[PDB]
Amino acid sequence: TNQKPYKETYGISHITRHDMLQIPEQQKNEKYQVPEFDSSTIKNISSAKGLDVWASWPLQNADGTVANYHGYHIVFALAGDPKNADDTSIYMFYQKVGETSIDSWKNAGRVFKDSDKFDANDSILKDQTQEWSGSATFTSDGKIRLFYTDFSGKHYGKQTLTTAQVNVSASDSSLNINGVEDYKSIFDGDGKTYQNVQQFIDEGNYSSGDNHTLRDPHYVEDKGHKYLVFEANTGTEDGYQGEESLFNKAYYGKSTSFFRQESQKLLQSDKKRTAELANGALGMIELNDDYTLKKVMKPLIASNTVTDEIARANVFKMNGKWYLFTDSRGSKMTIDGITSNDIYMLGYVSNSLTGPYKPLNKTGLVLKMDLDPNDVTFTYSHFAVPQAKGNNVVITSYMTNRGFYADKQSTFAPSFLLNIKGKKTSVVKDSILEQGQLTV
Ligand SMILES: OC[C@H]1O[C@@](CO)(OC[C@H]2O[C@@](CO)(OC[C@H]3O[C@@](CO)(OC[C@H]4O[C@@](CO)(OC[C@H]5O[C@@](CO)(OC[C@H]6O[C@](O)(CO)[C@@H](O)[C@@H]6O)[C@@H](O)[C@@H]5O)[C@@H](O)[C@@H]4O)[C@@H](O)[C@@H]3O)[C@@H](O)[C@@H]2O)[C@@H](O)[C@@H]1O
Ligand SMILES: OC[C@H]1O[C@@](CO)(OC[C@H]2O[C@@](CO)(OC[C@H]3O[C@@](CO)(OC[C@H]4O[C@@](CO)(OC[C@H]5O[C@@](CO)(OC[C@H]6O[C@](O)(CO)[C@@H](O)[C@@H]6O)[C@@H](O)[C@@H]5O)[C@@H](O)[C@@H]4O)[C@@H](O)[C@@H]3O)[C@@H](O)[C@@H]2O)[C@@H](O)[C@@H]1O
Ligand SMILES: [Br-]
Ligand SMILES: [Br-]
Ligand SMILES: [Br-]
Ligand SMILES: [Br-]
Ligand SMILES: [Br-]
Ligand SMILES: [Br-]
Ligand SMILES: [Ca+2]
């Protein structure tokens, strides 16, 4: 055949088959394992009575550290009725700084009223059916600036990175959401750098096996420049999905001998098409000072052949280096030895915000969680929260799968600590914090 191998990095970093195949052995080390949690201590968020509360994010200062909003910490979370998976709205919870109990989290309610997306006179928001995850920054002039994912069940799962300013009143006692403003779509994918939903739709959408994503926008600043880093998929010009992508050695790793081995297995494997379709990416755009789209930038990293889904993009500068993280499910990967119970947080390090990134702990493995989904202390959506001092970050996550238990809802997991040193990380032994704790 005249279809020959090649190597093209497209100028971006890559999560490779070589590195992923080392994780099943490496993940046996307790250094990379989410700690065992004691279910006897776990409570529902009492101020969110009856709602599942899952993927969540703190209001952050520009540097990623947790914001002090007039004496409060603020966390945005997705929540809704456990009996309806399509009930997904963003709620704002808060706690006085210094409190750490689960029962210190108060609930200011939903950020958005039903009419907000229609009052915005933004044509994409008119079609929103769910509010998916994001980030929130506390601006120089004291404003709460939210980014999140507008999901549209009406348009085959379209996902649009979206922003609003949340106007909140204080009261000694409680915080109040008075309304939102500057509510607008920012980016729905350009087709060339980031897949757009029209490519999903026209290739056959749900019956194609493709997984289109454009979500989880994370706000970050470098030198006054404003950016979103987000979960996406590559487009036509930066290593698109398809049979051809199986012939790019940059997706396999450094050795040509590993490449010919692994590629022939993959090409004749039951997971060939899944790997062809797999083209996840952590994308990056620059914003203008009014939070509109200024510049589409190339992905920080891509996961061609390995998975279509690298979620909850997170990036921050810590002690001189940039750390980039993403969550990913073993159930959607194509890597032998990685099982449908494996769940990971993967992590990468660079001297600059824009790359290039190198895998942490050699493989990119940072955290592994492999509890049965029915386990009450199952956790997902791990998220590294930068701290003002030291080498440790706080890992938040949600606990208990949505809708599984009548009386134990998805809740804030016990936080725990992750030590980050140069290119290596370690779960800090016996570092379990309160449920939902953001700071040490
Ligand atoms: O309180 C939450 C509760 O309300 C629902 C809406 O029923 O969620 C509304 C909440 O969701 C948010 C999030 O941003 O706004 C969603 C916005 O999008 C719309 C639609 O434009 O809602 C979509 C959700 O509603 C559902 C079903 O309730 O679909 C409506 C949608 O489905 C279609 C297609 O089949 O129709 C039909 C179905 O409905 C009946 O008429 C029953 O009444 C049947 O005859 C018929 O079989 C389509 O015609 C129609 O447009 C659901 O699939 C979607 O997720 C907005 O109305 C809404 O603002 C919140 O802002 C908002 O509070 C619900 O999901 C949830 O349980
Ligand atoms: O909660 C969001 C939050 O979670 C994070 C992680 O923290 O990750 C995403 C998480 O969400 C999951 C699943 O819950 O993965 C998402 C991926 O699954 C897809 C589909 O593969 O989306 C699911 C949503 O789309 C909906 C429908 O709008 O379901 C699609 C689903 O329904 C089927 C039938 O079951 O078809 C329905 C569809 O078919 C038609 O009839 C044809 O027209 C339509 O009328 C109708 O809409 C099925 O064929 C199809 O698979 C919605 O109900 C579902 O919720 C992907 O689009 C999506 O990428 C987790 O696995 C994952 O961790 C974070 O990233 C995020 O912010
Ligand atoms: Br409302
Ligand atoms: Br929906
Ligand atoms: Br195309
Ligand atoms: Br192709
Ligand atoms: Br193809
Ligand atoms: Br129960
Ligand atoms: Ca894909």
Residue-by-residue DSSP string for 407-432: S--SEEPBPEEEEEETTEEEEPTT--
Torsion of CA 101, 342, 333, 414, to 10 degrees: 10
The number of C-alpha atoms within 13 Å of 197 and in the hemisphere containing its C-beta is: 18
- In testing the pocket of ligand 1, which one of 88, 129, 132 has its CB within 8 Å of the most ligand atoms? 129
Structure tokens at 428: 């800090």
C-alpha distances out from residue 288 to 151, 294, 354, Å: 23, 5, 18
Q: Which letter, b or e, does each residue of 85-105 get, where b requires 16 or more Cβ atoms within 10 Å of its Cβ?
A: eeebbbbbbbbebeebebebb
Report the separation in Å between the CA atom of 347 and the middle of ligand 6, taken as the mean of its atom positions.
29
Report the separation in Å between the CA atom of 244 and the middle of ligand 6, taken as the mean of its atom positions.
4
Give the closest ligand to the alpha carbon of residue 279. Answer: 9
d(CA 230, CA 219): 9
55 near 77, Cβ under 8 Å?
A: yes
List own/partner pairs for 95-103 with CB under 8 A and 24 or more apart.
96/71, 96/72, 97/68, 97/71, 97/72, 97/73, 100/433, 100/434, 100/437, 101/434, 102/43, 102/45, 102/46, 102/411, 102/412, 102/434, 102/435, 102/436, 103/43, 103/46, 103/47
C-alpha distances out from residue 229 to 6, 299, 311, Å: 29, 9, 11
Report the separation in Å between the CA atom of 355 and the middle of ligand 5, taken as the mean of its atom positions.
27
Kindly give the interhelix angle for 17-26 and 256-267, rounded to the nearest 10 degrees: 90
In 3D space, the residue among 437, 438, 400 whose CA is nearest the CA of residue 52 turns out to be 400
d(CA 55, CA 422): 28
Give the closest ligand to the alpha carbon of residue 78. Answer: 2
Name residues contacting ligand 2 (CB within 6 A).
55, 78, 85-86, 88, 132-133, 149, 153, 157, 206, 211-213, 215-216, 231, 311-312, 381
Q: Are strands 311-318 and 321-329 parallel, antiparallel or unpaired?
A: antiparallel
Which residues 6+ apart lie within 8 Å of 264 measured at CB?
none
* E-state strands within 15-117: 52-60, 72-80, 89-96, 106-110
C-alpha distances out from residue 435 to 44, 143, 395, Å: 10, 27, 11
Total domains, the chain = 1
Of all protein residues, the one whose alpha carbon is nearest to atom 57 of ligand 2 is 157
Q: Is residue 218 classed as helix, strand or coil in its secondary structure? A: strand
Q: Is the peptide bond before 356 cis (omega within 30 degrees of 0)?
A: yes
Structure tokens at 433: 């914090």
- In testing the pocket of ligand 2, which one of 206, 212, 282, 379 has its CB within 8 Å of the most ligand atoms? 206
Its domain, for residue 48, covers: 1-436
Q: Are strands 365-369 and 52-60 parallel, antiparallel or unpaired?
A: unpaired
DSSP secondary structure letters along 109-151: EESS-TTHHHHT--TTGGG--EEEEEEEEE-TTS-EEEEEEEE
Neighbour count for residue 351 (Cβ, 10 Å): 12
Residue 386: DSSP 8-state: P
279 near 299, Cβ under 8 Å?
A: no
C-alpha distances out from residue 60 to 160, 215, 228, 355, 439, Å: 22, 18, 14, 23, 12
- What single-letter amino acid sits at 105? W
In 3D space, the residue among 409, 410, 415 whose CA is nearest the CA of residue 433 turns out to be 415
The number of C-alpha atoms within 13 Å of 61 and in the hemisphere containing its C-beta is: 10
Distance spanning both ends of the chain, measured CA to CA: 59
Please report the atom of ligand 2 found closest to the CA of residue 312: 65
- The H-or-E segment that residue 217 falls in is strand 215-222
List residues bridging with 393 in a β-sheet.
Answer: 418
List residues bridging with 333 in a β-sheet.
Answer: 307
d(CA 186, CA 189): 10
Report the separation in Å between the CA atom of 79 and the middle of ligand 4, taken as the mean of its atom positions.
14
Give the closest ligand to the alpha carbon of residue 204. Answer: 2
To one decimal, the resolution in angstroms is: 2.0
Report the separation in Å between the CA atom of 10 and the middle of ligand 4, taken as the mean of its atom positions.
35
Of all protein residues, the one whose alpha carbon is nearest to atom 50 of ligand 2 is 206
Which experiment gave this structure? X-ray
228 near 210, Cβ under 8 Å?
A: no
Of all protein residues, the one whose alpha carbon is nearest to atom 21 of ligand 2 is 211
Of all protein residues, the one whose alpha carbon is nearest to atom 56 of ligand 1 is 129
Q: Are strands 72-80 and 89-96 parallel, antiparallel or unpaired?
A: antiparallel
d(CA 128, CA 88): 11
In 3D space, the residue among 378, 376, 344, 412 whose CA is nearest the CA of residue 32 turns out to be 344
Name residues contacting ligand 1 (CB within 6 A).
81, 84, 86-87, 89, 112, 114, 128-131, 153
Give the closest ligand to the alpha carbon of residue 246. Answer: 6
28 near 103, Cβ under 8 Å?
A: no
Please report the atom of ligand 2 found closest to the CA of residue 88: 1
401 near 80, Cβ under 8 Å?
A: no
Q: Residue 405: phi, psi to the nearest 5?
A: -125, 135
List residues bridging with 13 in a β-sheet.
Answer: 301
Report the separation in Å between the CA atom of 391 and the middle of ligand 2, taken as the mean of its atom positions.
37
| Total residues found in the chain within this entry | 440
46 near 53, Cβ under 8 Å?
A: no
**In the block, residue with structure tokens 């808060």:** 94
